[PDB]
């Protein structure tokens, strides 16, 4: 009834979707061929027999990742027509993914999404998985979000985006794509749960004892975050939280909608054996500045909204005591215009351990979505890099000779400056 | 340094390199020099197995303070050396390296 459609764009989105759907199949007992040896309805559809087709599309402008999906262990899980692929990728170019290469694919993607929506009864919204500093993860994501806003102008559109890291980076033109995507989607998005590869690397090293993690472990952690977010739709709990609840409780103003994701019980097997992870402990770990999965120090800013999504053996009184302890803390400061900055969700299903993963089996877990003004510093860094590269006008010819104008660069930079000003304004205390 | 013939040629080839500071020194360059010495001297007529383990390591100044051979050993034979004989040989190899360059300096002055 509360069906939701997940859209995975680009290599980052497709691989995170691989991890997410592996986790969903494990959680709901669905075999990797769609058969089982309700709860599995907001994300899967039943076709006559036991076949459960996931309610998602995998769209990329490059055949490689989608073909890996098509021939992997989950080759028979996804509908072959919902694994949409192009011929030539966007080559880390926003213009290619938005204007030149993305226009030859957007119609097919919209047709498939319309088929999925028609197959649904009540559509809660969309989950868009993508990366900020990619070609199709930026241009095609922005194009798709604007087309969805044109079509489904009322359904919520939550996006899980890999924010560029402060120091580590795999591409040279990431600031351009990030600024342009922020412009276009900020026009047409509800809330964007943000994450950094560098922060997850640090989390893995410090907590999971892994010194050489790959993208696979990062995707597993992100999939755990997404599972914690969607558990209320997929399972039954004391306090249910829907997508509209996220949108309402985490977005104070239409432009300030970039919360940061966190996951407390990130722990290895032996350490989990030696610990007694409780509600208070996991909450304190969530509010620890070193456990943030976006490399921004929360002490540099003020929280405006927090969404604590507990799951498993969790008692509401313990949650209330832990939240009261957090509020009594002095290092954790909130904005003065949000006397109540905690949306609490509790689910009865403990997190499922993926066979072959690094996370240990725990009795309870919490995912914390925090909207804070500490993201303003990350925005400032991103626009500073954009300003340097645009002042030298580097790489601009690649974007211009592909259906874009330098005026769009200037407009996107001005919009980002306005966003920084808005963050500064909401940061200050009322007088 | 029980060979003598091989260490002689090896001190003539590392002279143009180690005089530079350590910051410009990178391990991937010296191996070609070591391999050249083992080919020119009498150490070429030798068991290929033991020659597979003899390499260089970079201690962490000047090039005459961070160069030293290692001869790593793993497997069953590693139960005789036990990571302590390899932490003692290198403790010895410095004293035999210094007392070897302090001599080839004094035969250059002469």
């Amino acid at each position: 009834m509360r069906e939701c459609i997940s859209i995975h764009v680009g290599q980052a989105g497709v691989q995170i979707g691989n991890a997410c759907w592996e986790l969903y199949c494990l959680e709901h007992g669905i075999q990797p061929d769609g058969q089982m040896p309700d709860s599995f309805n907001t994300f899967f559809s039943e076709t006559g027999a036991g076949k459960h087709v996931p309610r998602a599309v995998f769209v990329d402008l490059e055949p490689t990742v989608i073909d890996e999906v098509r021939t992997g262990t989950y080759r028979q899980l996804f509908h072959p027509e919902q694994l949409i692929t192009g011929k030539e990728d966007a080559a880390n170019n926003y213009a290619r993914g938005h204007y030149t290469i993305g226009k030859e694919i957007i119609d097919l993607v919209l047709d498939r999404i319309r088929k999925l929506a028609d197959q649904c009864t009540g559509l809660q919204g969309f989950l868009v998985f993508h990366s900020f500093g990619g070609g199709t993860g930026s241009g095609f994501t922005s194009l798709l979000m604007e087309r969805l806003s044109v079509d489904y102008g009322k359904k919520s559109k939550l996006e899980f985006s890999i924010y560029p890291a402060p120091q580590v980076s795999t591409a040279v033109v990431e600031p351009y794509n990030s600024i342009l995507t922020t412009h276009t989607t900020l026009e047409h998005s509800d809330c964007a749960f943000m994450v950094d590869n560098e922060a997850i690397y640090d989390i893995c090293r410090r907590n999971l004892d892994i010194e050489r993690p790959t993208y696979t472990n990062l995707n597993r952690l992100i999939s755990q975050i997404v599972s914690s977010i969607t558990a209320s739709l997929r399972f039954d709990g004391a306090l249910n939280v829907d997508l509209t609840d996220f949108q309402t409780n985490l977005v104070p103003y239409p432009r300030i909608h970039f919360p940061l994701a966190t996951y407390a019980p990130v722990i290895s097997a032996e350490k989990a054996y030696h610990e007694q992870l409780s509600v208070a402990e996991i909450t304190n770990a969530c509010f620890e500045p070193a456990n943030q999965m976006v490399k921004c120090d929360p002490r540099h800013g003020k929280y405006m909204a927090c969404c604590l999504l507990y799951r498993g053996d969790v008692v509401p009184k313990d949650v209330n005591a832990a939240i009261a302890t957090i509020k009594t803390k002095r290092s954790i400061q909130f904005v003065d215009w949000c006397p109540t900055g905690f949306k609490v969700g509790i689910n009865y299903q403990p997190p499922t351990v993926v066979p072959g993963g690094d996370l240990a089996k725990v009795q309870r877990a919490v995912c914390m979505l925090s909207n804070t003004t500490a993201i303003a510093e990350a925005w400032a860094r991103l626009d500073h890099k954009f300003d340097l590269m645009y002042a030298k006008r580097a790489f601009v010819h690649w974007y211009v000779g592909e259906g874009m104008e330098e005026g769009e660069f200037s407009e996107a930079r001005e919009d980002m400056a306005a966003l920084e000003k808005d963050y500064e304004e909401v940061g200050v205390d009322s007088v | 340094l029980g060979q003598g013939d091989f260490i002689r040629h090896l001190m003539d080839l590392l002279k143009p390199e180690l005089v530079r500071p350590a910051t410009t020194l990178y391990q991937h360059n010296l191996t070609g020099i070591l391999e050249t010495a083992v080919r020119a001297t009498n150490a070429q007529f030798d068991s290929p197995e033991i020659l597979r383990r003899l390499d260089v390591r970079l201690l962490e100044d000047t090039g005459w303070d961070v160069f030293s051979l290692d001869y790593h050993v793993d497997g069953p034979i590693a139960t005789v050396f036990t990571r302590e004989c390899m932490s003692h040989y290198l403790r010895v190899f410095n004293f035999l390296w210094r007392a070897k360059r302090m001599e080839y300096i004094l035969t250059d002055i002469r």
Partner: protein, 425 residues
């Protein structure tokens, strides 16, 4: 899908192309008779970018072998992997153009370029989705330089949106293999500046240094040098072909290393270069690969990057490795050498990672560098060119073939503009 048309011009181009097709067939498990004898399915997953499937499941390289003399054609045909190319793709003439750029660009290059253009049009119309072209040639040669230039210009005006990238062997600083090398090199570079997207400048003397000092080769022949160049070409288009954690085709590399249209000259490289003696003493890790590829001794052009600043670099890794190690090595390289990277381009490194390493290796990587040290090579070419042109030496050949001194002046002015742009940036 993303098919590449490979054109080999001249002796240098034909020999390097023969080695390149040998290594590519090794990667894809193609028999020298054209049959697939490989083991993994990924070899045939993207065989189409370089090969065309014939009738009896035999794979014919999408290569055009063009030369103005038949000796190289006969040598390529008679040797191993010579029965691999299509016999209709050997387009050659009789007179070998000498070492004259004008002969290969204006007198015999005309007829031979009409024929090779017909062949290239057929090959392109056969393709499903053309990614671009790649040319192997030498700038200091005869038919090689001039004819590669003419083909580049004509194919560019026919296919302007495709990626045209060339692996050109530039003249060496110390010893020249051709007396008229500066003239041919200057004219070829003047034509390459405007009609090419990616020019990988390779010098034979840097390759000799690599073979003698890094590979400890006692008698390095042209086979080894061509193997190195082929490994670089492999690495790039392997990032294109095989699956990986972070893909990058030719166009992505072109976007990430060409900040300005005329600044598209690169110094290639290859990380896992070890002598047979030292292969047992060296640990094959991402830090080792990075330290070797960023070493000034490994770069395949005789231009010291310490004399300039890296506009951009590209690291194409191959093999199963951790993305965190790659990114942390990239960050450490940028931080340590902050004085050797341009300040107005943050994150001067473009990282691609492929899952399939080259045969016989566990890890590998190719380094592409857009640095302002190519200005040294162009400066050397300019001094030699102006030294010969001031007294008008060996010029009557070029004039008699049908050229003019105004063309020489334009070529040297364009190359001086190139060095001015590099020095400015």
């Amino acid at each position: 899908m993303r098919e590449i048309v490979h054109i080999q011009a001249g002796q240098c181009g034909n020999q390097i192309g023969a080695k390149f097709w040998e290594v590519i067939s090794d990667e894809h498990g193609i028999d020298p008779s054209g049959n697939y004898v490989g083991d993994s399915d990924l070899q045939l997953e993207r065989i189409s970018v370089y090969y065309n499937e014939a009738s009896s499941h035999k794979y014919v390289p999408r290569a055009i072998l063009v030369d103005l003399e038949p000796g190289t054609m006969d040598s390529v045909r008679s040797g191993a992997f010579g029965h691999l190319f299509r016999p209709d793709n050997f387009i050659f003439g009789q007179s070998g153009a000498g070492n004259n750029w004008a002969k290969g660009h204006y007198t015999e290059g005309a007829e031979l370029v009409d024929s090779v253009l017909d062949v290239v049009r057929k090959e392109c119309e056969n393709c499903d989705c053309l990614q671009g072209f790649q040319l192997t040639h030498s700038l200091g040669g005869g038919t090689g330089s001039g004819m590669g230039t003419l083909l580049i210009s004509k194919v560019r005006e026919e296919y302007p949106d495709r990626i045209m990238n060339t692996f050109s062997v530039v003249p060496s600083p110390k010893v020249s293999d051709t007396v008229v090398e500066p003239y041919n090199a200057t004219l070829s570079i003047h034509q390459l500046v405007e009609n090419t997207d990616e020019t990988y400048c390779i010098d034979n003397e840097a390759l000799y240094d690599i073979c003698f000092r890094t590979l400890k080769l006692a008698t390095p022949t042209y086979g080894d040098l061509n193997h190195l160049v082929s490994a670089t070409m492999s690495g790039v288009t392997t990032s294109l072909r095989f699956p990986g954690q972070l893909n990058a085709d030719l166009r992505k590399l072109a976007v990430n290393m060409v900040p300005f249209p005329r600044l598209h000259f690169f110094m290639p490289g290859f990380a896992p270069l070890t002598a047979r003696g030292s292969q047992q003493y060296r640990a094959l890790t991402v830090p080792e690969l990075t330290q070797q590829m960023f070493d000034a001794k490994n770069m395949m052009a005789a231009c010291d990057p310490r004399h300039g600043r890296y506009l951009t670099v590209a690291t194409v890794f191959r093999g199963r490795m951790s993305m965190k190690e790659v990114d942390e090595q990239m960050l450490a390289i940028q931080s340590k050498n902050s004085s050797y990277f341009v300040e107005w381009i943050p994150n001067n490194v473009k990282v691609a990672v492929c899952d399939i390493p080259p045969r016989g290796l566990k890890m590998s990587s190719t380094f592409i560098g857009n640095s302002t040290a190519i200005q040294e090579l162009f400066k050397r070419i300019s001094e030699q060119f102006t030294a010969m042109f001031r007294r008008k030496a060996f010029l009557h050949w070029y004039t008699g073939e049908g050229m003019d001194e105004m063309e020489f002046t334009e070529a040297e002015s364009n190359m001086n503009d190139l060095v001015s742009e590099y020095q400015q940036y």
